Design a protein around this ligand. Structure first.
Ligand SMILES: CC(C)CCC[C@@H](C)[C@H]1CC[C@H]2[C@@H]3CC=C4C[C@@H](OC(=O)CCC(=O)O)CC[C@]4(C)[C@H]3CC[C@]12C
Ligand SMILES: CC(C)CCC[C@@H](C)[C@H]1CC[C@H]2[C@@H]3CC=C4C[C@@H](OC(=O)CCC(=O)O)CC[C@]4(C)[C@H]3CC[C@]12C
Ligand SMILES: CC(C)CCC[C@@H](C)[C@H]1CC[C@H]2[C@@H]3CC=C4C[C@@H](OC(=O)CCC(=O)O)CC[C@]4(C)[C@H]3CC[C@]12C
Ligand SMILES: CC(C)CCC[C@@H](C)[C@H]1CC[C@H]2[C@@H]3CC=C4C[C@@H](OC(=O)CCC(=O)O)CC[C@]4(C)[C@H]3CC[C@]12C
Ligand SMILES: CC(C)CCC[C@@H](C)[C@H]1CC[C@H]2[C@@H]3CC=C4C[C@@H](OC(=O)CCC(=O)O)CC[C@]4(C)[C@H]3CC[C@]12C
Ligand SMILES: CC(C)CCC[C@@H](C)[C@H]1CC[C@H]2[C@@H]3CC=C4C[C@@H](OC(=O)CCC(=O)O)CC[C@]4(C)[C@H]3CC[C@]12C
Ligand SMILES: *[C@@H]1O[C@H](CO)[C@@H](O[C@@H]2O[C@H](CO)[C@@H](O)[C@H](O)[C@H]2NC(C)=O)[C@H](O)[C@H]1NC(C)=O
Ligand SMILES: *[C@@H]1O[C@H](CO)[C@@H](O[C@@H]2O[C@H](CO)[C@@H](O)[C@H](O)[C@H]2NC(C)=O)[C@H](O)[C@H]1NC(C)=O
Ligand SMILES: *[C@@H]1O[C@H](CO)[C@@H](O[C@@H]2O[C@H](CO)[C@@H](O)[C@H](O)[C@H]2NC(C)=O)[C@H](O)[C@H]1NC(C)=O
Ligand SMILES: *[C@@H]1O[C@H](CO)[C@@H](O)[C@H](O)[C@H]1NC(C)=O
Ligand SMILES: *[C@@H]1O[C@H](CO)[C@@H](O)[C@H](O)[C@H]1NC(C)=O
Ligand SMILES: *[C@@H]1O[C@H](CO)[C@@H](O)[C@H](O)[C@H]1NC(C)=O
Ligand SMILES: *[C@@H]1O[C@H](CO)[C@@H](O)[C@H](O)[C@H]1NC(C)=O
Ligand SMILES: *[C@@H]1O[C@H](CO)[C@@H](O)[C@H](O)[C@H]1NC(C)=O
Ligand SMILES: *[C@@H]1O[C@H](CO)[C@@H](O)[C@H](O)[C@H]1NC(C)=O
Ligand SMILES: *[C@@H]1O[C@H](CO)[C@@H](O)[C@H](O)[C@H]1NC(C)=O
Ligand SMILES: *[C@@H]1O[C@H](CO)[C@@H](O)[C@H](O)[C@H]1NC(C)=O
Ligand SMILES: *[C@@H]1O[C@H](CO)[C@@H](O)[C@H](O)[C@H]1NC(C)=O
Lengths: 311, 311, 311
C-alpha cells in the first residue's frame, strides 16, 4: 500500500511543482505588438581622408533619415566624385585587353560595368581596358580606408523608444537623470540610451573591425511579463547579438551646366536590427482545470498499473 | 444524491458553455502573415511662410517615397538654406564667449556642432560665440512655425491595402463606390480610404497640436476570423491609437559652381505605423477530445470529494 | 466483451497515431525572430527611350538603397525633367476651360494640381486649361512606356541572407559553388541567389506585364523545424506568391543658378516582400502527460457508455 501512496505523491509533486509553479501551467500566453523609435546623436569629423576636415551629421550617416527598426550607421565609405554618363575605360576587373580584336560590343554577361564598344582605351599609363558606356569615371573600391573614416561613431548614442501592447489582455507598456544616463548591462540596465561602441562590444564584436568594413548588430527587447504581478514589474531586457561585412552603394545626383552627374558612395556601415519579442501570461481557469483532470487521469494509469503489476 | 447530480450539472455547464461555446475550446488558433501598401493623396500649399506660395506633393511630404508599414507625413518644417562646409560662429547654445581664452580647439564633448578653433566670432550684433568648422550657416530650430506649414495634411487621404494569409489553414484574405468613399468608425467601417484628420481624431489627439510639432499614430488591423464560418465573414477591424513630438533632420544635397551645399530640413511630422495582428481558429479534434477527457477527470475529483466529504 | 476491447483499440490508435505521431502532440511549439538582408545585382540600359543610351545601377533602381525586407526594383518609369515652382497651365484632367469665367481662384477640391488663378492659358495648340501655381511643367503620365525601360531587370539576381532564431529553445539558424549558383524550385532548392524573372514566374505572374506597369511579389521563407532531429535538418523552404500595378513618385531636387528644380519620376516597379515565418517543436513532458490523461478519460466515457448502452 505504501507504493500507491508514493505514486500519488510523485504525481501531486509533478502537477503542483513542475506543471503549475515552475512552468506556469495555470496561465494563458499572449504575444505582443510593438513600435520602435530610434534617435541617433553625435557628430563625426574626417580630418585627413576628407582632403581637409569633413563633418558628418545625423542627416548624413543614418539610413534611412526618418528612422526604422532596421537602420544603418555609416562608419566608412569610398566616394567616386562627379560621375557622368559617357564613354570611358572599365576596371581591369572587366578584363585587360591589348587590341581591338578582344573587345566585343555589347553588355557583358558577368560583372557588367556598362555597354562595351569595339575599342580599347588606356585605363592608366600601363593597363589598357575595354571602352564602355556607363557612369564615368569608374569606381575603384579596392582600397577600403583604414583606419575607418567615421571611427567616432563608437561614441554616438542610440536612444530607443519601444511601446508594446499585449492585445489579448489590454496591457500597454513603454520602455522608459535618464537624459544624462547611459546603459550598462548591470549598473544601468534600464536606461534606453545606448552607446554604439558598447552595443557592438556586447554583441561580441570589435568596433574597429566592424567599422572598417561594416557589420550587422541585432538588438532584442524581451518582454517576459507575468500579468498576475503588477504591471510595474513588466520591464524589458536588452539582448545584444550579431546577425563578412555590410556595404551598400548610394548616389547623390546633381546637375551642373545642364548635365546630370552623381556622387557615388560605397558605404561600409553597421546595420542595427531592433527585434522586439515578448510573452505575457495571466491566470486562466481552462488550463488549470485541464491540468488537474489529466493529472487525475495519470493517477489512474499509475495506480492501476502498480496494482495489476503487483497482482 | 442530489448533490452529485448538481456536480455533474455544473461540470457539464462549464465544459459546454465556457470551455467550448464561449472560449472556442474546440478550435485551433493560427496567426497570420500580412503585407500592407499605403498610398497618400493630397496637395499642400504654404502661402506666407514660404516667401511666396510653395507647393508640397506626395513625392515630398511622405517618407519614404516608396512607402512602408511605418511612414512619416510632414506637417511642419524648418529649413536652413544653402549650408556649406566652412568656418562660422556656433549657436549660443554651444556657449557664449567674450574672449579667445574661453575657446578650446577641438570637438566639444556635448552638443558638438563642429570643430571649434581658438577664435571668437560674432553670432550677431550682440552675442559672440566660438568659431567652428562645420555646416554653415548654423541651424536655428528654436522658432517652430505656428500655425503649421502643412496644416492641410488633415485633408489628405490614406489608402491602405492589406493582404493577409493564415498559412496553417491556407486561407488568404484582402481588406478591399469605394473610390469616392471615406471611412467612418460606424457609418463606413469597411472602406480602406482614411482621412488623416479623422485618423488622428480617432487616436485621441488634436491635429493642430500633433501637426505643429509632430506625433506618432498607430493603426491596427485586426483579423479575428472563425474559419468554421464562411470566409466572407473574415473582415478587418481598424483600430486607431497613439504610440512629445516626432521630428527628423533630412538634407537635400546640391552643387553650385563646383561646391557642395545642402538644404537642411527639420521635419515635424506624424509617423504612421500600420500594425496587422489577427487570430484564426478552426475546429480541431485534438482540443475537443482533450477538453472532454479532462472534464471526465474533474467529474471524478468532484464526485469522489463530495462522497468522501459526506462519509 | 469484444466491443470494449475494440474501443480500447480505437483510442490507443487515436492517441498514438493521430495525437502523437501524426500531429506531434508530444511537442511544444515556438515561433522565431528573423533578420533578412537582400543584395541586388545587375545593370540595365535604356537605349532608345533614354534619348541615347542610359544606364541604371543598383544605387538607382533599388528603393531603398540600404535595403529592407520590403523593397522596390524599378522596371519602368516616366520622367518629368526640370520641374520648377511657377505659373503654368494644368493637365486637361483638371478641366478644359474656354474663358476666364470658368476659372475659380484657389486650390481645387479633387485632383488638385496646384493653386488655380482667375486666368485661362493654353496647354497646347488646342486645349486651353486653367492656370495654376505649382511644379511646372506639369507631368503627363498617360503614356506608360511599352516595352518597359528596365526590361533587363528579369536577369538581375537577388541574394537573400536570412538569420533566424527560435528564442525559446536557444537555436539560431542561417539560410546559407554557391557563388555561381542559381535557385531552381527542384534542381537547386537551397541556393539563396534568385533571379527576378524566375521569382516572378514562380509567383504565377508574367514579367513583361508586371514590368510595364509594376506589381507586388511576396517571398516567404518557411522554417518548419523538428528540434528532436539534428539542427542540420532545419532548412528553409522558399515560397513565392503575388500579394493592378505598383507605382510611386520620387523627385531628385537640384539647384541651377540659385533656383530649385526637380526631376519627377513615376516609378512602375515590383515590390518584393520577404516574409519569414516558422514553427519549431521540441519534445516536452507536459503535453505528453496531458494527452495520456485525457486519453484515459476518453477510455472511461467510452467504456461506461458502451456498458450502460448494452445494459
Ligand atoms: C495541483 C492541482 C491539483 C491544483 C491545485 C493547486 C492550484 C489550484 C494552484 C497551484 C498554483 C496556483 C497559482 C500560483 C500562483 C498564483 C499567482 C497569484 O497572483 C496573485 O494574484 C497574487 C497577488 C494579488 O493578489 O494581486 C494568484 C494565484 C495563482 C494564479 C495560483 C492559483 C492557484 C494555483 C493554480
Ligand atoms: C500544495 C497543495 C495543498 C495544493 C495547493 C497548491 C499550492 C502550492 C498553491 C495554492 C495557493 C498558492 C499561492 C497563492 C498565491 C500566492 C501569492 C503570489 O504572489 C505574487 O506573486 C504576487 C506579487 C505581486 O503582486 O507583485 C505568489 C504565489 C502564492 C504564494 C501561491 C503559491 C502556491 C500556492 C501555495
Ligand atoms: C461537452 C463535451 C462533453 C463534448 C460534447 C459537445 C461538443 C461535441 C460540441 C460543443 C460545441 C460544438 C461546436 C460548436 C460550433 C461548431 C461550429 C459548426 O460550424 C459549421 O461548420 C456550421 C456551418 C457549416 O455547416 O458550414 C461546426 C460544429 C462546431 C465546431 C461544434 C462541434 C461540436 C462541439 C465541439
Ligand atoms: C448540450 C449537450 C447535448 C451536448 C452537445 C453540445 C451542444 C451545445 C452543441 C452540439 C451541436 C452544436 C451545434 C452544431 C452546429 C451549429 C451551427 C453553427 O452555425 C454557424 O455558426 C455557421 C454559420 C455560417 O456558416 O456562416 C452555430 C452553432 C451550432 C448551432 C452548434 C451549437 C452548439 C451545439 C448545439
Ligand atoms: C500513447 C500514450 C499512452 C503514451 C505512450 C507513447 C509515448 C510515450 C510516445 C509516442 C510518440 C513518442 C515520441 C515519438 C518520437 C520521438 C522523437 C525521438 O527523437 C530523438 O531524440 C531520437 C534521436 C536521438 O536520439 O537524438 C525522441 C522520442 C520521441 C519524442 C518519442 C517520445 C515517446 C512518445 C511521446
Ligand atoms: C505503441 C505502444 C507500445 C506505445 C509506444 C508508442 C510508440 C509508437 C513509440 C514508442 C517509442 C517510439 C520511437 C522512439 C524513438 C524514435 C526515433 C526517432 O528518430 C528520429 O526521428 C531521429 C532522427 C535524427 O536524429 O535525425 C524516430 C521515431 C522513433 C522510432 C519512435 C517511433 C514511435 C515509438 C515506437
Ligand atoms: C594601373 O592600374 C592597374 C589596375 O588597377 C594597377 O595594377 C594593380 O596594381 C596594384 C598595386 O600593385 C595591385 O594590387 C593590383 O593587383 C594590380 N591590378 C592588376 C589587374 O594587375 C597598376 O599598378 C596601375 N599603374 C599605375 C602606374 O598606377
Ligand atoms: C542675437 O542672438 C541671440 C541668441 O539667439 C539672441 O538672444 C536670444 O533672444 C531671444 C529673444 O529674446 C531669447 O528668447 C533667447 O533666450 C536669447 N538667447 C540667449 C542665449 O540669450 C539675441 O536676441 C540676438 N540679437 C539680435 C539683435 O537679434
Ligand atoms: C493637346 O493636348 C490634349 C490633351 O492631352 C490632347 O488631347 C488628347 O489626345 C489624345 C490623343 O488623341 C487622347 O487620347 C486624349 O483623350 C485627348 N485628351 C483630351 C482631354 O481630349 C491633344 O491631342 C493635344 N493636341 C496636340 C496637337 O498635340
Ligand atoms: C570616444 O571617447 C573617448 C573618451 O576618452 C575617446 O578616448 C575616444 O577616442 C572616442 N572615440 C573616437 C574618437 O573614435
Ligand atoms: C579589438 O578591440 C581591442 C579593444 O577592445 C583593440 O585594442 C584591438 O585593436 C581590436 N582588434 C584589432 C585587430 O585591432
Ligand atoms: C554648358 O553647356 C553648353 C552646351 O554644351 C556649352 O556650350 C557651355 O560651354 C557649357 N558651359 C560650361 C561652363 O561648361
Ligand atoms: C479641410 O477641408 C475643410 C472643408 O470645409 C476645410 O474647412 C478645412 O480648412 C480643410 N483643412 C485645411 C485647409 O487644413
Ligand atoms: C483641439 O481641437 C479643436 C477641434 O477639435 C480645436 O478647436 C482646438 O483649437 C484644438 N486645441 C488647441 C489647443 O487649439
Ligand atoms: C566658381 O569657383 C571658382 C573657383 O573657386 C571661382 O574662380 C569662380 O569665381 C566661381 N564662380 C562663381 C560664379 O562663383
Ligand atoms: C536575359 O538573358 C537571356 C539570355 O539568353 C536573354 O535572352 C534575355 O533577353 C535577357 N533579358 C533581357 C535582355 O531583358
Ligand atoms: C507572358 O509570358 C510569355 C513568356 O512566358 C510571353 O511570351 C508573353 O508575351 C507574355 N504575355 C504577354 C501578354 O505578352
Ligand atoms: C541667374 O539668376 C539671376 C537672378 O535672377 C539672373 O540675373 C541671371 O541672369 C541668371 N543667370 C542665368 C545663367 O540664368
Amino acid at each position: 500500500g505504501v507504493i500507491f501512496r508514493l505514486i500519488q505523491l510523485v504525481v501531486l509533486v509533478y502537477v503542483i511543482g513542475w506543471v503549475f509553479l515552475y512552468e506556469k501551467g495555470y496561465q494563458t500566453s499572449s504575444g505582443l505588438i510593438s513600435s520602435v523609435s530610434v534617435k541617433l546623436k553625435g557628430l563625426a569629423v574626417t580630418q585627413l581622408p576628407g582632403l581637409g576636415p569633413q563633418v558628418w551629421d545625423v542627416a548624413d550617416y543614418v539610413f534611412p533619415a526618418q528612422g526604422d527598426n532596421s537602420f544603418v550607421v555609416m562608419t566608412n565609405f569610398i566616394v567616386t566624385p562627379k560621375q557622368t554618363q559617357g564613354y570611358c575605360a572599365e576596371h581591369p576587373e572587366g578584363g585587360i585587353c591589348k587590341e581591338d580584336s578582344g573587345c566585343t560590343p555589347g553588355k557583358a554577361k558577368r560583372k557588367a560595368q556598362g555597354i562595351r564598344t569595339g575599342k580599347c582605351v588606356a585605363f592608366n599609363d600601363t593597363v589598357k581596358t575595354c571602352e564602355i558606356f556607363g557612369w564615368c569615371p569608374v569606381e575603384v573600391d579596392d582600397d577600403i580606408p583604414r583606419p575607418a573614416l567615421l571611427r567616432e561613431a563608437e561614441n554616438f548614442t542610440l536612444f530607443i523608444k519601444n511601446s508594446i501592447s499585449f492585445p489579448r489582455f489590454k496591457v500597454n507598456r513603454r520602455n522608459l537623470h535618464m537624459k544624462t544616463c547611459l546603459f550598462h548591462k548591470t549598473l544601468h540596465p534600464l536606461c534606453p540610451v545606448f552607446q554604439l561602441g558598447y552595443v557592438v562590444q556586447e554583441s561580441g564584436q570589435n568596433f574597429s573591425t566592424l567599422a572598417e568594413k561594416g557589420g550587422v548588430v541585432g538588438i532584442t527587447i524581451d518582454w517576459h511579463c507575468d500579468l498576475d504581478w503588477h504591471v510595474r514589474h513588466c520591464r524589458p531586457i536588452y539582448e545584444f547579438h550579431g546577425l563578412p561585412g555590410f556595404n551598400f552603394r548610394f548616389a547623390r545626383h546633381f546637375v551642373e551646366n545642364g548635365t546630370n552627374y552623381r556622387h557615388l558612395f560605397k558605404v561600409f556601415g553597421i546595420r542595427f536590427d531592433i527585434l522586439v519579442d515578448g510573452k505575457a501570461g495571466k491566470f486562466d481557469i481552462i488550463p488549470t482545470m485541464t491540468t488537474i483532470g489529466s493529472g487525475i487521469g495519470i493517477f489512474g494509469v499509475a495506480t492501476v498499473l502498480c496494482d495489476l503489476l503487483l497482482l
